[PDB]
Amino acid sequence: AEVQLVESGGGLVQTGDSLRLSCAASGRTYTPYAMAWFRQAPGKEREFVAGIGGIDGTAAYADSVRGRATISRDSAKKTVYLQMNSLKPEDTAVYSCATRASMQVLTSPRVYPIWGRGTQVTVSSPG
Ligand SMILES: O=C(Nc1ccc(Cl)cc1)Nc1ccc(Cl)c(Cl)c1
């Protein structure tokens, strides 16, 4: 593909912890285009978590992460960040970022042609 995505910043954490995921884009990038984080637990479909697009850096969040997540981008670093706070075991999944040749952020995975590999996020009851 003309753009490659590589996620980092996943981890193994405890309930209540924070993690900052990063998506580093390379190739023929255009930073106002929609960047969308999805997550996928085993057996389950990928679901939208958060996304950013457009000239205002407009953020959209799934109800699942209502009040716990902040998405942002740094155009000079071609990087999108997803800060997740107050993590809980139900958040465990592989998080992957995806992009498409439009500033329009959409919640369907179907409309994104370009995907990263994913990073693992595991949240366990403290111990
Ligand atoms: O480049 C991007 N997205 C992007 C978004 C934010 C940052 Cl910081 C960096 C890159 N998309 C894109 C670009 C070209 C094509 Cl063909 C397609 Cl299909 C998608």
mmCIF file of C-alpha atoms and ligand atoms in Angstrom:
data_model
loop_
_atom_site.group_PDB
_atom_site.id
_atom_site.type_symbol
_atom_site.label_atom_id
_atom_site.label_comp_id
_atom_site.label_asym_id
_atom_site.label_seq_id
_atom_site.Cartn_x
_atom_site.Cartn_y
_atom_site.Cartn_z
ATOM 1 C CA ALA A 1 0.000 0.000 0.000
ATOM 2 C CA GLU A 2 0.984 3.640 -0.353
ATOM 3 C CA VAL A 3 0.750 4.133 3.458
ATOM 4 C CA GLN A 4 2.002 1.797 6.183
ATOM 5 C CA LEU A 5 0.757 1.908 9.813
ATOM 6 C CA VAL A 6 2.674 0.638 12.822
ATOM 7 C CA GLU A 7 1.190 0.639 16.325
ATOM 8 C CA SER A 8 3.104 0.772 19.621
ATOM 9 C CA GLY A 9 2.475 1.425 23.349
ATOM 10 C CA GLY A 10 0.288 -1.467 24.266
ATOM 11 C CA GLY A 11 0.957 -3.280 27.549
ATOM 12 C CA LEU A 12 0.076 -5.522 30.394
ATOM 13 C CA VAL A 13 -1.547 -3.381 33.042
ATOM 14 C CA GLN A 14 -3.826 -3.394 36.050
ATOM 15 C CA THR A 15 -7.360 -2.157 36.498
ATOM 16 C CA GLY A 16 -7.330 1.575 36.882
ATOM 17 C CA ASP A 17 -4.105 2.057 34.885
ATOM 18 C CA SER A 18 -3.427 4.345 31.866
ATOM 19 C CA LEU A 19 -1.731 3.539 28.535
ATOM 20 C CA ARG A 20 -0.830 5.748 25.567
ATOM 21 C CA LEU A 21 -1.075 3.866 22.299
ATOM 22 C CA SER A 22 0.713 5.331 19.215
ATOM 23 C CA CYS A 23 0.145 4.820 15.494
ATOM 24 C CA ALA A 24 3.139 5.843 13.297
ATOM 25 C CA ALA A 25 2.244 6.357 9.595
ATOM 26 C CA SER A 26 4.838 6.308 6.780
ATOM 27 C CA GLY A 27 4.719 6.531 2.942
ATOM 28 C CA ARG A 28 2.426 8.934 1.014
ATOM 29 C CA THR A 29 0.693 10.352 4.130
ATOM 30 C CA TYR A 30 -1.769 13.248 4.450
ATOM 31 C CA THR A 31 -2.385 13.885 8.107
ATOM 32 C CA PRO A 32 -5.981 15.333 7.946
ATOM 33 C CA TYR A 33 -7.159 11.922 6.650
ATOM 34 C CA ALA A 34 -9.245 9.820 9.048
ATOM 35 C CA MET A 35 -7.252 7.725 11.524
ATOM 36 C CA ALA A 36 -9.381 5.237 13.502
ATOM 37 C CA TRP A 37 -8.465 2.894 16.384
ATOM 38 C CA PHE A 38 -10.345 -0.428 16.476
ATOM 39 C CA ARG A 39 -10.042 -3.262 19.049
ATOM 40 C CA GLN A 40 -10.632 -6.977 18.686
ATOM 41 C CA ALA A 41 -10.828 -9.559 21.520
ATOM 42 C CA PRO A 42 -10.473 -13.232 20.457
ATOM 43 C CA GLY A 43 -13.512 -14.723 18.695
ATOM 44 C CA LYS A 44 -15.007 -11.248 18.374
ATOM 45 C CA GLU A 45 -15.476 -8.759 15.608
ATOM 46 C CA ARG A 46 -13.297 -5.633 15.408
ATOM 47 C CA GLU A 47 -15.078 -2.651 16.951
ATOM 48 C CA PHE A 48 -14.449 1.082 16.690
ATOM 49 C CA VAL A 49 -12.779 2.696 19.667
ATOM 50 C CA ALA A 50 -11.743 6.229 18.643
ATOM 51 C CA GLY A 51 -10.932 8.316 15.611
ATOM 52 C CA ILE A 52 -9.489 11.648 14.390
ATOM 53 C CA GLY A 53 -9.773 13.450 11.127
ATOM 54 C CA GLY A 54 -10.186 16.764 9.466
ATOM 55 C CA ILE A 55 -8.571 20.171 9.724
ATOM 56 C CA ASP A 56 -9.774 20.689 13.340
ATOM 57 C CA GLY A 57 -8.340 17.441 14.636
ATOM 58 C CA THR A 58 -11.951 16.465 15.442
ATOM 59 C CA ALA A 59 -12.097 13.446 17.764
ATOM 60 C CA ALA A 60 -14.843 10.766 17.878
ATOM 61 C CA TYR A 61 -15.149 8.134 20.754
ATOM 62 C CA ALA A 62 -17.095 4.868 21.088
ATOM 63 C CA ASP A 63 -19.568 4.756 23.945
ATOM 64 C CA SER A 64 -17.313 2.015 25.405
ATOM 65 C CA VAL A 65 -14.537 4.529 26.135
ATOM 66 C CA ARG A 66 -16.809 7.490 27.000
ATOM 67 C CA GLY A 67 -14.851 9.760 29.351
ATOM 68 C CA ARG A 68 -11.715 7.575 29.494
ATOM 69 C CA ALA A 69 -10.017 8.161 26.098
ATOM 70 C CA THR A 70 -8.310 11.053 24.334
ATOM 71 C CA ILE A 71 -7.145 10.857 20.692
ATOM 72 C CA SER A 72 -4.740 13.289 19.084
ATOM 73 C CA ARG A 73 -2.294 13.683 16.259
ATOM 74 C CA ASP A 74 1.092 15.157 15.628
ATOM 75 C CA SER A 75 1.446 15.900 11.904
ATOM 76 C CA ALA A 76 5.197 16.577 12.133
ATOM 77 C CA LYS A 77 5.713 13.072 13.601
ATOM 78 C CA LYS A 78 3.006 11.471 11.398
ATOM 79 C CA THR A 79 1.718 9.923 14.602
ATOM 80 C CA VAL A 80 -1.784 9.486 16.109
ATOM 81 C CA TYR A 81 -2.014 8.958 19.899
ATOM 82 C CA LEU A 82 -4.788 7.237 21.912
ATOM 83 C CA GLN A 83 -4.562 7.939 25.631
ATOM 84 C CA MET A 84 -6.697 5.446 27.639
ATOM 85 C CA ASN A 85 -7.322 5.996 31.359
ATOM 86 C CA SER A 86 -9.176 3.962 34.026
ATOM 87 C CA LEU A 87 -8.547 0.755 32.133
ATOM 88 C CA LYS A 88 -10.589 -2.304 33.018
ATOM 89 C CA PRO A 89 -10.381 -6.059 32.197
ATOM 90 C CA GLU A 90 -13.117 -5.691 29.545
ATOM 91 C CA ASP A 91 -10.718 -3.440 27.622
ATOM 92 C CA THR A 92 -8.386 -6.363 26.890
ATOM 93 C CA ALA A 93 -7.913 -6.757 23.090
ATOM 94 C CA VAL A 94 -5.606 -6.190 20.179
ATOM 95 C CA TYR A 95 -5.826 -2.447 19.259
ATOM 96 C CA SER A 96 -5.112 -1.567 15.613
ATOM 97 C CA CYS A 97 -5.216 1.673 13.680
ATOM 98 C CA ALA A 98 -6.646 2.124 10.204
ATOM 99 C CA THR A 99 -6.777 4.924 7.617
ATOM 100 C CA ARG A 100 -8.479 5.858 4.374
ATOM 101 C CA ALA A 101 -8.144 8.564 1.703
ATOM 102 C CA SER A 102 -10.771 10.854 3.251
ATOM 103 C CA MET A 103 -10.998 13.164 6.277
ATOM 104 C CA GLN A 104 -14.399 11.607 7.043
ATOM 105 C CA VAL A 105 -14.112 9.428 10.214
ATOM 106 C CA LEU A 106 -16.499 6.426 10.043
ATOM 107 C CA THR A 107 -17.146 3.657 12.610
ATOM 108 C CA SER A 108 -17.356 0.714 10.116
ATOM 109 C CA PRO A 109 -14.074 -1.171 9.621
ATOM 110 C CA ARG A 110 -15.240 -1.813 6.037
ATOM 111 C CA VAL A 111 -14.461 1.631 4.701
ATOM 112 C CA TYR A 112 -10.716 1.566 5.728
ATOM 113 C CA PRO A 113 -8.323 0.023 3.217
ATOM 114 C CA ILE A 114 -5.165 0.456 5.253
ATOM 115 C CA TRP A 115 -4.450 -1.240 8.549
ATOM 116 C CA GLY A 116 -1.673 -1.648 11.055
ATOM 117 C CA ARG A 117 -0.675 -4.934 12.714
ATOM 118 C CA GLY A 118 -2.136 -4.121 16.142
ATOM 119 C CA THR A 119 -0.735 -3.807 19.680
ATOM 120 C CA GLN A 120 -1.816 -5.958 22.641
ATOM 121 C CA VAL A 121 -3.592 -4.394 25.624
ATOM 122 C CA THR A 122 -4.161 -6.641 28.578
ATOM 123 C CA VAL A 123 -5.806 -5.431 31.781
ATOM 124 C CA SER A 124 -5.895 -7.647 34.845
ATOM 125 C CA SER A 125 -7.414 -7.180 38.305
ATOM 126 C CA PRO A 126 -4.601 -5.774 40.400
ATOM 127 C CA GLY A 127 -2.204 -8.468 41.569
HETATM 128 O O1 LIG B 1 -2.052 9.349 5.431
HETATM 129 C C1 LIG B 1 -3.146 8.988 5.888
HETATM 130 N N1 LIG B 1 -3.479 9.126 7.177
HETATM 131 C C2 LIG B 1 -2.773 9.720 8.192
HETATM 132 C C3 LIG B 1 -3.530 10.287 9.214
HETATM 133 C C4 LIG B 1 -2.906 10.945 10.286
HETATM 134 C C5 LIG B 1 -1.505 11.007 10.341
HETATM 135 CL CL1 LIG B 1 -0.725 11.823 11.725
HETATM 136 C C6 LIG B 1 -0.722 10.429 9.344
HETATM 137 C C7 LIG B 1 -1.371 9.815 8.256
HETATM 138 N N2 LIG B 1 -4.093 8.378 5.163
HETATM 139 C C8 LIG B 1 -4.004 7.970 3.873
HETATM 140 C C9 LIG B 1 -3.080 8.505 2.952
HETATM 141 C C10 LIG B 1 -3.022 8.063 1.631
HETATM 142 C C11 LIG B 1 -3.860 7.018 1.248
HETATM 143 CL CL2 LIG B 1 -3.778 6.433 -0.450
HETATM 144 C C12 LIG B 1 -4.775 6.475 2.139
HETATM 145 CL CL3 LIG B 1 -5.833 5.106 1.637
HETATM 146 C C13 LIG B 1 -4.825 6.927 3.464
#
